[PDB]
Each structure stands twice: as structure tokens, then as C-alpha cells.
């Protein structure tokens, strides 16, 4: 659940979640949230797991951008900064603030605690907001499969639009095999590993605290200018998706309802979405590179290659 | 939601190939040849509706529909072991039995003359499915169905499901024989101009390379018909291994596409298989580290596809899907990715974005693997313009020469004039010229 | 008061229809095919006398007169195990063994011919029931008796019971004269029968080669599929529950009101016995997902890309260990999905029944479910028809074997008259579609 395995699931809740845009989820009781999960559950293979019934759903105070800034502007001077800041200049929240919790009973009630459960909940949201931004992104590519309707030199314009959003799309995903293949299966073996070899519950509980640091750590969480700079490029991502969605939609019915126009459905602000896409990464490869000299953090030289791996960003770095 | 596959077999290539394909899938969902459900993975954790119809008998059936314009093949799948598994209702063969004769103009002549029943067969199974994710093309860019049929199922298809992604298996006809068919060479320009302008992905699958791996490293004297099938089925195994296993992230066909296709028009992803060897090198218990995998994907020996290397023309990657399968520490693969950057084991296209990526998987648990470790490369990289450039060239000498053009004449497609075919020899042209450039630091 | 259903099995299909029911029937209450409960029987949790008459030696016999115009038959049940089930003289067979000659208008002179012995059976056994609650006719539309005399009992039945359901099972064809019998018979069905339950054989055909792997399927098989479907339309009688346990809210949830009684069936689990589907724990949402699935239906509509057909009504009775709190999950996750599309002119009838099955019939699943539909698709059926009547009136074809008959000696002004109703029917359907529909033919 929270890690996302079997994430089935969760490219099925995305298009619940997708109806709901406009306000924060915590605005609204989880008890139909719940109902429509268990109704999308039994589509799917799931019975043989009989865990899931531990799993409920908490409405945040603060969506996942904002309160993951919080977090990382406490006990430092961008508290003071970012205490005006809102969600509405950037990506708006309407389905960020969905996260899972583990609820279980004495004496596994020990091995979970609220401590834990708020890096969890942080954690589950970011996952679930960065996988739906990728499904959002992979759906508007495949919606884009009737501009092979039209002839090549009429779409120009969207050809230039559809490689921003193909660059943006690359980012996520690669952002997303790194940070799951790469840090999540790792750290689940080597927690899984400790609790295996060890036998005391103050022992485990020590090692899922540092899983946790770990896993918050590698998904950039303890450098504030990092968090920022992914927050940002994530909703610039999620912001041009949506802007694409609506005349992609549009295009599409027209294509397949008939079986200069497409110069005015490519507005202006693709260039400004692009432009913005590119300031981004490269903040986030130089801070990375910083952040790898001189705090000599493991995972941001990961991110570094990840980002310069085509001949043209590694004397960019 | 499942993100269902339909596979179009189409001639005799693309059924032969459709067939292997479902043998493989078959074993790897452990699915008797008969339709049942083998015991042994009725607890499977395997989500089989991503590519498995579920039958009234609790039985995974591939929606996968057998189109042939000659009785032959369509009637060897029928008597084959996996008669039983397939639904009767979604065979479609041409009661005219007499193909498309090695022409593309019949083939889609013939395509055009049965649209009604492959479009009814089409939307019976999109409407079976619940969240069909696109259509699978298995055909031959050389013979006259596989071409020409199979060019306008594609265009239906893509017309018919335009939010769907259209992947297709294209053999591409062998290079250095002097083809039987002496319209070969059109057969196969018509069928790269149709995954230029009709199909999201064209998977080239050379015969002629093919032959030459398992002659080189298999050692099979005149390889038959059935290995060639058994290696396609390999092919389209380890490319469906990351749906097959469940993992964080890519886990649809859509987020595959993202990954292997940067750039619309260079959306040909080429396949990469390791290890190359014959069952009798039982090659001791070699531990393969992801740097020997790794090395073993960018080898030429194991590429399936027979590119020229010119020497004139830097050739680059611009794009690398690395699928690793089986007990893989991911330590070890960000160990192997940090050891081929140092390494520059890989040149890419100067002016695209940076993708390689690498999918952890673990392998089917019915099927035995002798090696601890494998690992399956789809790479979009231009040098496949050098097998288009080799099928135009072999156009252009027919051409030139009016060679093999009688029964594109005979066709109504061509008998007032060839335009067809110089508009496919000019997306050809452009598709070699936008490789190039993709090769080039201003194909921005 | 008991509430007894007369079966008229009529031709060799209502006959053979009606053979299964009983069978099915037997095997259910653990019956021996003499009619006599078996020992294991004693403690039944269905009491015969719903469907059955009691005879004083304990003997359960089926409130069913078959009626066939061939001596093959008749003599072959006569030799059959099921013998000893029916009543000898509760069988009539015409002596003039000449038939209808697959007519309808020859079907319905006959049973003009023989309405005093049929309409003596009917009462007969109307007032050996203490409650009759209407009558189940099992014909085909297609043959001469079974379509002719089914209608004209049928009229019959209507006349003299007035107050009583009159359900059908009315076997569609996959005879020159057939547009001429589909015609009358859909007529008749749509003016003078409550509720037509429609058996598409070439939708049965379909499902059992593409489902069971049965190459060729026999008309024994289909029949045993049919008869299945029977049981399943009996379920909800066999189980004590709060609603619907009569043919009268049977026939007004499934065929959605009497005149509009065309209804489209549903079967599940459809599976050979040799598919011993693994170890899945079927679940509620499972079931209703295989209903609502087009393979799973047992009539052939034709997806018409103009008509944007819904469903009318639709009552799921749920035989077998079934999780109530799973039937209203699946019901609210269908709703909210929108799986089925209803009708935009009325109520969204989406029923579920759970019922316990019957101790002696052996349930491989441990739920299963049956679906009847009213649904506006049916229409297609009815529009295949009327193109096929057009066909033949256009060449006025198959027409001489009909001007031999009295009802067709001068004209053929009442097969018009079928025709101007079926159309009726056909757009009374296609604003069923329309939200108006509930004001279009008022």
C-alpha cells in the first residue's frame, strides 16, 4: 500500500482522485475514499493479502507540497519565508493530501507509532501525487496517438509542445525508476534483513527509524532547497499536463469524430512551461552536485548521473 | 486496471511469431496447452489480465486474433498443441485462399476487402476488454500479407483507437540474400513507411541477424523456422517480463513508451538478448554481475537486428531500456550504471534527453532459469536507419530497374500510377534523415 | 393456498424445454424419475407443491401437459426414465398426426381445433391448484405448433384467466415460412403474454462452442442449458425471503411491464463441468462483473452502432453462500461505475435476491447468479425479425402453404396487422432509449 507495489491500485485511484482538483481531500470525509478503494480492490487480484484491512485513510491539515516545505523550513530561517506560501500559485492539492496509515493492534500497536506514521504519511503522499502526475503525463502521450491523423508539417507547433512534455515525462519517470529500484527495494531488504537477524522490537523499531531516515533522505527531504526545487518541477509538470489535457481531449474528439487551428490550440505558455522545466533540472543537478561535494550525501551523485546522461548536461552540471 | 494487448498475427510471419508468442506467454502464466490453469500458479500473484483473457473456466487465453490470407498456417495453429487454448470465435481465416501472392497492394487490398469482419473481431475484443492499453502487431514487412494486410490493420487500429498504443513485431526481410520475392524490397519500404506514419513503436526483428546468432553463437546449422520462432518468443517474453512482474514503477505499457520513445518519429526501439549460448555450454555457475550484463547488452553480438557499423556516421543511442530479470541487488545496478558513465560504455544523441533506465523484475517462478541473472535491452537508437536505409536501397534497385512491379500494377492502389510507393520511399528517406540528424548535436 | 404454475410444453422444443424443467425440478427436491421423493429426500427444504402436484403415494408430478402433433416423441418420453413422472392422461396428442407443417396460421387452426381438450386441461388443473398463479408456456415462435397453438392458448389463457401471469419461454429461431411464424409469434407474445423470456438458439450455440469447447453443440445441450435457466428463474421460489417470490413480480421486474415483454436472459456460471475452474473464491462483485459481461449473455443483440440501448429492468437472483454485505457492495460499486446502462425514462430496477440453493441438486459454485433483463438491446432481435417478415412479404415468399389455411385463404391482413404491431413494439423500444420514453406511446 504505501510503497506502492502492485501500484494497479494506484493508477486505478488516480482517476478517482482526478475528479477531485479544486479543494483539499481532507475537506471531505475518508469514509467514501475507503469505499471506493475496497470497490476498486476486488477488480483487482488482491485477496491473497489479509493486511489491508489495517490500512485507513487520515485528512491532513496541509497538503503534501506545503507541509513537506514545513517540514523542511522548521528550526531553520525559511519558516518565516514560506509561512505565507500557498498551493494555489503552485500545483493546486485536491487529491495530495490521500495517505495511508497502519493502525494495529497491542502489542503491534508498539512497533508503529505516530513518529513513524507522519514520515509514512508523507512519504505514501508523495509517492501517490508523483505516480499520478506520471500517469497523467503517459496518458497524455497516448492521447496523442490521432496526431498521426494529421500530416507531420501541420503540427509543428505541437510537435515542439509534445518534446517538452516527452522531456518532462523522461524526468519523471527516470526520477521515479531511480528513487523506487534504486533506493526503496534496497532499504525494504536491508529493514527486512535486520528484523530477520534481530529479535528485539526496540532493535526493530531502531532499524525501521532509520529505514525511514534513509528513505527520507534519499527522496531529497533533509535539504530544503532540494525539496523545494523537486515540489517546483513537479508541479510545473503537473500544471502543463493539465494546460495539455483539455486541447488534446478537444483534438482528440474532433479526430475521431470526423472519421492555423492547431497554431492557436498551442498557447504561449508552453515555451514559458518548457523554459521553467529546464531552469529546474538545472538547479536541481547543480544543488545536487553541491550537495554531493561538500555534505557528501549517497544519493544526490545518483541523481546528478541521472539527471546528466546524455553528453549535453554533464558540462552543464 | 488491467491494461489489456491485442496481437494481431497477420501472414504467415506474423502467425508464426503471434503463435510463439502465445506458447511463451502460456508458459510463463503456467497455462496448459489445453486452456487450464496449471496448480502451480493458480496462487500466483502475477496480474494475468494485463495480457490474459480470463474464460468462463477460470482459464488465461491470450487476446490474440490469427489473421491469414493462406489456409496453411492458420490450419497448423488450429492443429497445434495450443488449439484448445485459443477462443474459436476471435480466428479469422481467409476463406480465399490465395494470399497476397508476395504483394503489398494485394495484402492490403485483401485487408481492405475483409476490414469488416478484422474490425468486428477488433471491437469485440476492445468492448471484452475492461481497459485495453493498445493493439500488438506481429507481421512480416517482407511477404505480401504480413505487408500489406498488416500495414491496414495498423492504420485501422490506429484509427479505431487513437488513446491506445500501437507496438508492433515488423520482420524486417534479410539484407544480403538475394530475396526470392523480387518485391521484397517494396513489401518491406510499404511496411516502413507504415510504422513511420501509423504504429507508436515498430520492434524491427531481423531474420537475416537472427540467422546469424544462431548460426555464431548457437552453432545451428541452417537455423529452422521453429528456433527462429522460439527466440521470437524469447524476445516478446523478456520484453513482457516488467508487466509480467509487478514492480514500483513503469508498471504499464504507457510509462514503457515513455521510457523508450523520446522522440515521435524515433520511436523504433531495437531488442537486446543475453546470454547467447547453446544448452550444451553448461557455462559453470558464472555469477553475472550487472557490469557483465550490462557489457553483454551493448555487445553487437547480441543486438537482433544487423545494422551496417559505418564508420562515417557516429552512430548514438537515444534512448536505453535496461530489463534486468531475477535475484538483482539494486546496489549492484546503480553500481553498473555509475560503472558504464565512468566508462562511457554508451554514446548518445547529442541533442536529445538523457534516458537509461533499469527496471529490477523477478522471473516467472514456472520457468526454469539457469542463470541467476538475465537481462533483456530495448534501445531507440538511429542506427536502425541503417537497416532503413538498406530496405530503401533495395527499393530504389527495383525501382530504377520497374523490378517486381507487375503485381503492384495489377492492384488498384497502384494501377493508375506508383505514388503509393514514392510517398513510402519519401517517409523512408526522411526517417533515414531524421536518424542522422538524431545522431547530430542539432537534432534539437 | 398453494400457487400452482401450469407448464405448457408445446412442439418439440416446449416439450423438450419442459422434459428439463421437470428433470431439473426432480433432481433438485430428490425426486426418483418414478416421481417418488427419495429416501434422502424426506427432510427437503423445498416443498414440491409448488411447481408439482402430490399424488396420494406421495409422488411428485409436474403441473405440465405436453403437447406434441409427432408420435416420435411422445413414444420416446413414454420410454424414457421420466415415464412414471407426467400424468398419462394429462397428455393430449392429436390422433391426425398431419402437424401444422411448420405454419403458424396452420399452429393456431389447430389449436382452434383441439381448444376444448386444451382449455380442459387448463382448468383442470386450475382448479386442482388453490392458488394458480399463471401459466409458463414453452414454445418456439418459429415452428407451427409451437408458435400457432402456444399463441392461441396463450389468447386462451388470457380470455379465461385474466388475472393470472402469463410467462413464456419462446425459443428464437438461429422454413420459408419463418419470418411468417417469428412474426405472429412476437405478436402474440407482445400483446397477450405478461412476460416473454427469450432463448436465442444461435446466442446458445455461440456460448457453447466458444465455452464449453463443444464442437457442434447438440439441440440436447442447448435444451439442458435452457433448463438450467429454468431452475434459476425458479430459485427465488425455493428460498423464504422479504420480496418477489411470484410469477407476477417476476414477469413485471423482467419483463418490464406485459407489453413490453421482450426479455433478454443471463446465465452464470457458464462453464462445461470439465472446466474445473481453479480454486477463485467467486465474489458477489465477480458475479454481477460476469452478468453484466457480453459473453456471459445468452442472447444474441446486435451492437447497432445508432441505438444507444439500456437496460429497462434487471432482478439477479443469487443462489448459494452469499455474502449480503458483498451482493450491496457489488450492487453500489456497478452503480458507481455505471457497468449497466438503465433506462433514462423510469426507475433504474436493479434487483438482487439471495436465496439458499436446494439440498439435492449439486451447486459446483458456491454462488451463482441469474440475471433477467429488460433491456432496450432486445429490440434488435425484434428489428432482425421485422427485416426478415419485409424479406419474405416484399417476394411473398413461402405464402402458398398459408393460403391453404383458412385464417389466410382471402388475405393476409392479420400477418399485417403482427406487422404494424411489431413495429410499435420496435419503436416503442428505440424511446425506451429517450427519456420520454415513459410518455412516448401515451
Not at chain 1, 530561517?77 to 506560501?85: F, G, L, P, R, Y
Not at chain 2, 538475394?178 to 515498430?202: E, F, G, I
Not at chain 2, 553480438?301 to 564508420?311: A, E, I, L, W, Y
Request: negative net charge.
Amino acid at each position: 500500500y504505501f510503497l506502492m507495489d502492485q501500484g494497479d491500485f494506484f493508477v486505478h485511484f488516480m482517476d478517482l482522485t482526478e475528479e477531485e482538483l479544486k479543494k483539499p481531500v481532507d475537506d471531505i470525509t475518508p469514509t467514501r475514499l475507503e469505499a471506493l478503494l475496497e470497490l476498486a480492490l476486488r477488480m483487482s487480484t488482491a485477496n491473497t493479502d489479509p493486511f489491508k484491512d489495517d490500512l485507513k485513510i487520515d485528512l491532513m491539515p496541509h497538503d503534501l507540497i506545503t507541509q513537506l516545505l514545513r517540514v523542511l523550513a522548521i528550526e531553520t530561517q525559511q519558516e518565516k519565508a514560506m509561512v505565507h506560501a500557498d498551493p494555489t500559485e503552485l500545483t493546486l492539492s485536491g487529491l495530495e493530501a490521500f495517505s495511508f496509515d497502519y493502525v494495529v493492534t497491542w502489542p503491534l500497536s508498539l512497533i508503529i507509532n505516530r513518529k513513524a506514521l507522519t514520515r509514512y504519511q508523507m512519504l505514501f503522499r508523495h509517492m501517490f501525487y508523483c505516480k499520478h502526475v506520471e500517469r497523467q503525463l503517459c496518458s497524455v502521450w497516448i492521447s496523442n496517438k490521432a496526431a498521426k491523423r494529421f500530416s507531420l508539417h501541420s503540427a509543428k507547433w505541437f510537435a515542439g509542445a509534445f518534446t517538452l512534455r516527452q522531456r518532462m515525462l523522461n524526468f519523471v519517470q527516470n526520477i521515479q525508476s531511480y528513487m523506487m529500484f534504486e533506493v526503496m527495494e534496497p532499504t525494504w531488504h536491508v529493514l527486512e534483513q535486520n528484523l530477520r537477524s534481530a529479535s528485539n522490537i526496540d532493535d526493530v523499531l531502531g532499524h525501521h527509524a532509520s529505514f525511514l531516515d534513509n528513505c527520507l533522505k534519499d527522496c531529497m527531504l533533509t535539504n530544503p532547497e532540494l525539496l523545494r526545487v523537486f515540489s517546483k518541477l513537479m508541479s510545473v509538470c503537473v500544471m502543463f499536463t493539465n494546460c495539455l489535457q483539455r486541447f488534446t481531449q478537444s483534438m482528440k474528439l474532433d479526430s475521431e469524430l470526423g472519421h492555423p487551428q492547431l497554431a492557436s490550440s498551442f498557447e504561449a505558455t508552453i515555451t514559458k512551461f518548457d523554459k521553467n522545466f529546464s531552469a529546474h533540472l538545472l538547479d536541481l543537478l547543480a544543488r545536487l552536485s553541491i550537495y554531493s561535494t561538500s555534505d557528501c550525501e549517497h544519493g544526490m551523485a545518483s541523481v546528478i548521473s541521472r539527471l546528466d546522461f546524455n553528453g549535453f548536461y554533464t558540462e552543464r552540471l | 486496471m488491467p491494461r489489456e494487448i491485442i496481437t494481431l498475427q497477420l501472414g504467415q510471419c506474423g502467425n508464426q511469431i503471434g503463435f510463439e508468442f502465445w506458447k511463451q506467454l502460456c508458459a510463463e502464466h503456467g497455462i496448459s496447452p489445453e486452456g487450464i490453469v496449471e496448480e502451480f500458479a493458480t496462487e500466483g500473484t502475477d496480474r494475468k489480465d494485463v495480457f490474459f483473457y480470463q474464460a468462463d473456466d477460470e482459464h488465461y487465453i491470450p487476446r490474440a486474433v490469427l489473421l491469414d490470407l493462406e489456409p496453411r498456417v492458420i490450419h497448423s495453429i488450429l492443429n497445434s498443441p495450443y488449439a484448445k487454448l485459443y477462443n474459436p470465435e476471435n480466428i479469422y481465416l481467409s476463406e480465399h485462399g490465395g494470399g497476397a501472392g508476395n504483394n503489398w497492394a494485394s495484402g492490403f487490398s485483401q485487408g481492405e476487402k475483409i476490414h469488416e469482419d478484422i474490425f468486428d473481431i477488433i471491437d469485440r475484443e476492445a468492448d471484452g476488454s475492461d481497459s485495453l492499453e493498445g493493439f500488438v502487431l506481429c507481421h512480416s514487412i517482407a511477404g505480401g500479407t504480413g505487408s500489406g494486410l498488416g500495414s491496414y490493420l495498423l492504420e485501422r487500429l490506429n484509427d479505431r483507437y487513437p488513446k491506445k498504443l500501437v507496438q508492433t513485431y515488423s520482420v524486417f526481410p534479410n539484407q544480403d540474400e538475394m530475396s526470392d520475392v523480387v518485391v521484397q524490397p517494396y513489401n518491406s519500404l510499404l511496411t516502413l513507411k507504415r510504422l513511420t506514419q501509423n504504429a507508436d513503436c515498430v520492434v524491427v526483428l531481423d531474420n537475416t541477424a537472427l540467422n546469424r546468432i544462431a548460426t555464431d553463437r548457437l552453432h545451428i546449422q541452417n537455423p529452422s523456422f521453429s528456433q527462429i520462432n522460439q527466440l521470437v518468443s524469447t524476445i516478446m517474453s523478456a520484453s513482457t517480463t516488467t508487466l509480467r512482474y509487478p514492480g514500483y514503477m513503469n508498471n504499464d505499457l504507457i510509462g514503457l513508451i515513455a521510457s523508450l520513445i523520446p522522440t515521435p518519429r524515433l520511436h523504433f526501439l531495437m531488442t537486446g538478448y543475453t546470454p547467447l549460448t547453446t544448452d550444451q555450454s553448461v557455462a559453470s555457475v558464472r555469477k553475472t554481475t550487472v557490469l557483465d550484463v550490462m557489457r553483454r547488452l551493448l555487445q553487437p553480438k547480441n543486438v537482433m537486428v544487423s545494422t551496417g557499423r559505418d564508420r562515417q556516421t557516429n552512430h548514438c543511442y537515444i534512448a536505453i531500456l535496461n530489463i534486468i530479470q531475477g535475484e538483482v541487488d539494486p546496489t549492484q545496478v546503480h553500481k553498473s550504471l555509475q560503472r558504464i558513465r565512468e566508462r562511457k560504455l554508451a554514446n548518445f544523441i547529442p541533442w536529445g534527453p538523457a534516458s537509461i533506465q533499469v527496471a529490477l523484475s523477478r522471473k516467472s517462478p514456472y520457468l526454469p532459469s539457469a542463470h541467476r541473472v538475465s537481462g533483456l535491452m530495448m534501445a531507440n537508437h538511429t542506427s536502425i536507419s541503417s537497416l532503413f536505409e538498406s530496405s530503401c536501397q533495395q527499393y530504389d534497385k527495383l525501382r530504377k530497374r520497374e523490378a517486381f512491379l507487375e503485381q503492384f500494377r495489377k492492384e488498384d492502389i497502384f494501377k493508375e500510377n506508383f505514388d503509393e510507393l514514392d510517398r513510402s520511399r519519401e517517409v523512408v528517406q526522411e526517417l533515414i534523415d531524421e536518424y542522422h540528424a538524431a545522431t547530430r548535436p542539432d537534432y534539437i
